[PDB]
Every structure is written in structure tokens, then in C-alpha cells.
Design an enzyme around this catalytic site. Structure first.
Site, PDB file in Angstrom:
ATOM      1  N   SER A 165      20.906   3.313   2.571  1.00  0.00           N
ATOM      2  CA  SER A 165      19.690   3.155   1.766  1.00  0.00           C
ATOM      3  C   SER A 165      18.626   2.293   2.459  1.00  0.00           C
ATOM      4  O   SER A 165      17.460   2.388   2.087  1.00  0.00           O
ATOM      5  CB  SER A 165      20.019   2.608   0.377  1.00  0.00           C
ATOM      6  OG  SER A 165      20.806   1.434   0.468  1.00  0.00           O
ATOM      7  N   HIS A 194      30.966   0.912  -0.978  1.00  0.00           N
ATOM      8  CA  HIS A 194      29.553   0.562  -1.138  1.00  0.00           C
ATOM      9  C   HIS A 194      28.815   1.735  -0.517  1.00  0.00           C
ATOM     10  O   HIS A 194      28.501   1.717   0.675  1.00  0.00           O
ATOM     11  CB  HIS A 194      29.220  -0.758  -0.442  1.00  0.00           C
ATOM     12  CG  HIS A 194      30.126  -1.883  -0.834  1.00  0.00           C
ATOM     13  ND1 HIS A 194      29.816  -2.721  -1.890  1.00  0.00           N
ATOM     14  CD2 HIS A 194      31.317  -2.261  -0.305  1.00  0.00           C
ATOM     15  CE1 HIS A 194      30.811  -3.594  -1.954  1.00  0.00           C
ATOM     16  NE2 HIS A 194      31.739  -3.356  -1.024  1.00  0.00           N
ATOM     17  N   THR A 195      28.621   2.803  -1.322  1.00  0.00           N
ATOM     18  CA  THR A 195      28.055   4.103  -0.925  1.00  0.00           C
ATOM     19  C   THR A 195      26.670   3.988  -0.285  1.00  0.00           C
ATOM     20  O   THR A 195      26.345   4.787   0.596  1.00  0.00           O
ATOM     21  CB  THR A 195      28.069   5.083  -2.105  1.00  0.00           C
ATOM     22  OG1 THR A 195      27.208   4.568  -3.123  1.00  0.00           O
ATOM     23  CG2 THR A 195      29.508   5.347  -2.667  1.00  0.00           C
ATOM     24  N   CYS A 196      25.873   2.981  -0.702  1.00  0.00           N
ATOM     25  CA  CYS A 196      24.539   2.672  -0.181  1.00  0.00           C
ATOM     26  C   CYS A 196      24.580   2.273   1.275  1.00  0.00           C
ATOM     27  O   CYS A 196      23.576   2.402   1.963  1.00  0.00           O
ATOM     28  CB  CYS A 196      23.884   1.578  -1.018  1.00  0.00           C
ATOM     29  SG  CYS A 196      23.198   2.164  -2.585  1.00  0.00           S
ATOM     30  N   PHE A 197      25.714   1.723   1.722  1.00  0.00           N
ATOM     31  CA  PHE A 197      25.937   1.260   3.076  1.00  0.00           C
ATOM     32  C   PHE A 197      27.066   2.032   3.760  1.00  0.00           C
ATOM     33  O   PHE A 197      27.558   1.581   4.803  1.00  0.00           O
ATOM     34  CB  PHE A 197      26.232  -0.253   3.074  1.00  0.00           C
ATOM     35  CG  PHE A 197      25.196  -1.087   2.361  1.00  0.00           C
ATOM     36  CD1 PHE A 197      25.416  -1.534   1.062  1.00  0.00           C
ATOM     37  CD2 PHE A 197      23.997  -1.420   2.983  1.00  0.00           C
ATOM     38  CE1 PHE A 197      24.458  -2.308   0.399  1.00  0.00           C
ATOM     39  CE2 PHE A 197      23.035  -2.185   2.316  1.00  0.00           C
ATOM     40  CZ  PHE A 197      23.269  -2.619   1.026  1.00  0.00           C
TER      41      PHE A 197
END
Ligand SMILES: [Cl-]
Length: 334
Positions: free
Chosen positions: A285, A306-309
């Protein structure tokens, strides 16, 4: 146990009652593909759109009818996000553009895109674009809440998180109501039109046994993951490529089937989709972010992401079987 392949087979079985004999011709040009597709798809009845698709590009006498239909789905799925139409915008991942209303016939285009997505599912064809997980939940008529916000609006998520992790418009109900509203905020009419088009081809209840991640796989296809590419572009925090847990993780990846690898990819990154260039081009992100494995807590801890990272928090497990059991459970959760 959750069995994607069985669910697909039962889904095909149900789709037979909607199957129609013979074919329909879809004549479209490559220059005006989006607009030709719109006039062609909207001129046919839903029942006719359930006949075998014969996509034709005039001038091209292609005998590979299957190949042309696959190409039309691939090309049209790219046109869905074209800014010239102001229908969908990026947020692969698409979202309804709230400015779409500027074109007074915008709801007809959403009805058309709804038919298109239902046609891909009905004809067993993949698209080269996609939606957010909360939007796949919406296609499935599954409830959406606070957890679904983190991936779409982090600032809003954190402010709603503060209302829960501390103590006026008519707490648990409010935070849930607000989250639901935020997920379709200012795009409610477009969404309703999309579902009108979608449901006339494929009633969304035919998809009732799938979770959101399985629906994404069904729309993307169970693409074979290059294990070497994944491994060459994996980075580590408080771990090394020589670590027992890391060597067990890669052993676990080789052992599981390709549906389980996609499920693992969705667990860590939030999607089963990969950039054209593979794992090296993975985006987070905040900028480029390669798949990362971090050592967190102790052996009793559960795996977290932590899907954003594009980050897996992998606890230091005692055995390969403890690693296999904890990850399988973590990636299965719906
Ligand atoms: Cl779900």
C-alpha cells in the site's frame, strides 16, 4: 474441510438448469470493443446470453472460437476501468467511480458490466481485472463489517477502531452500520444496477457455498504459481533463508496443491492475483513490497498476516508438522 473443487462442481451442476442450446454471435471490433460489447450484450435477452458464446472480430476468420471468447473476456475486463467511461477506477483491484453519475446513462453501463461478470462465471471464463474482497462478499450476499475496512480505508478503519478500543447518529451497531455504509458510500445506485445485470444472468444465490477468496479464484482461475520466482523474491525479517522455519515454510509450499498455494497467497497479500512480472513486482500500500516473512512471538502463537505489506508473521514453530498444521488452519479461515 473446505473443498473448492467440489464447490465448483456443484456450482456447474446448478448452472445446467440455466444452460441453453446452440449459440449467440457477439460481433465486436477491436477499436470500439467496449461500446460494441455494450450494444451487443444489451441487445440480447438473459436466456440468450446463456447459450454458447460465439465472439467474432470482423475480418478475423479465427477457427479458435474458444480462444476468441477468452480474448474478448480478457480485453473487455481491461476496458471496464477505462477513465474515458468513468465507471470503475483503481483502488488489478477496481471500485465503482462515484463520479459515474455525470453520464446520465451510467446505470445502463453498470447493468451491462453486471451481466459481463455473471457471464464470465456462467461460461467458465476468467477476467484480467478484479474487485476488493468486501466487493466479492457483496456478490455472495455475505455481511460486511469493520474488519473489511482495513484494506479499503485505513484512516476510517483506525477512527472506527478508536471507537471500539475506547469509550451521535441513530456502539457495536453504530461501528457495524458505519462500516457497511462506508463500503458502498456514494455508489449505492451503481451497485444496485450492477446486481440487476448480474442476477438476470446468474442468480447470486448459485454462488452461496463459496467464501470471498474462492469467488476471486473462480474469476481469476487457479493459475500455477512459479515456486522458484516466489522463493527468489521473498524477503525476511528476524529470519534468514537458512532458518529451520523458513526451510519448513518452503517445504510446506512444495507439499500443498496449487489451490492451497493461492489460498496462502491470498492470506499474506489479500489477493490470488500476481503482477505480469511475478513476485519481484509485488506492490504494497506504500510502494513496492516483496513477499516478506517475519519471526513473531512464540511456538503457541497463531500465524498472522499484514496484507498491506505482503507480510507473514511466522512464529518459531518446533516442528514441520506444527508449521503445516498452524498455516493450513490460518489460510483456511473465512
Ligand atoms: Cl467470505
Amino acid at each position: 474441510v473446505r473443498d473448492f473443487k467440489a464447490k465448483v462442481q456443484y456450482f456447474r451442476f446448478w448452472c445446467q438448469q440455466l444452460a441453453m442450446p446452440q449459440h449467440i454471435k457477439i460481433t465486436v471490433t477491436r477499436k470500439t470493443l467496449f461500446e460494441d460489447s455494450f450494444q451487443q450484450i444489451m441487445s440480447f435477452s438473459p436466456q440468450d446470453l446463456r447459450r454458447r458464446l460465439w465472439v467474432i472480430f470482423p475480418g478475423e476468420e479465427g477457427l479458435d472460437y474458444g480462444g476468441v471468447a477468452r480474448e474478448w473476456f480478457f480485453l473487455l475486463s481491461h476496458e471496464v476501468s477505462n477513465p474515458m467511461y468513468c465507471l470503475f477506477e483503481y483502488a488489478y483491484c477496481l471500485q465503482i467511480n462515484p463520479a459515474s453519475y455525470i453520464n446520465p446513462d451510467h446505470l445502463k453501463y453498470f447493468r451491462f458490466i453486471g451481466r459481463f461478470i455473471a457471464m464470465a462465471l456462467f461460461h467458465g471464463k476468467f477476467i484480467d481485472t478484479g474487485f476488493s474482497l468486501p466487493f466479492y462478499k457483496r456478490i455472495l450476499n455475505k455481511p460486511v463489517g469493520l474488519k473489511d475496512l482495513e484494506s479499503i480505508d485505513p484512516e476510517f478503519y483506525n477512527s472506527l477502531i478508536w471507537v471500539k478500543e475506547n469509550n451521535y447518529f441513530s456502539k457495536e451497531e453504530y461501528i457495524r452500520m458505519v462500516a457497511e455504509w462506508r463500503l458502498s458510500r456514494g455508489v449505492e445506485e451503481q451497485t444496485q444496477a450492477f446486481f440487476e445485470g448480474f442476477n438476470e444472468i446468474l442468480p447470486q444465490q448459485y454462488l452461496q457455498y463459496f467464501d470471498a477468496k474462492e469467488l476471486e479464484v473462480l474469476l481469476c482461475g487457479m493459475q500455477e504459481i512459479d515456486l522458484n520466482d516466489w522463493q527468489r523474491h521473498a524477503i525476511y525479517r528476524r529470519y534468514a533463508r537458512t532458518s529451520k522455519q523458513i526451510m519448513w515454510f518452503w517445504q510446506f509450499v512444495k507439499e500443498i496443491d496449487n489451490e492451497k498455494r493461492m489460498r496462502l497467497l491470498q492470506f499474506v497479500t489479500g489477493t490470488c492475483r500476481l503482477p505480469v512480472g511475478g513476485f519481484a513486482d509485488l506492490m504494497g500500500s506504500n510502494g513496492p513490497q516483496k513477499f516478506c516473512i517475519e519471526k513473531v512471538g512464540k511456538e503457541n502463537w497463531l500465524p498472522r498476516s499484514h496484507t498491506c505489506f505482503n507480510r507473514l508473521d511466522l512464529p518459531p514453530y518446533k516442528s514441520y508438522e506444527q508449521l503445516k498444521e498452524k498455516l493450513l488452519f490460518a489460510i483456511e479461515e473465512t
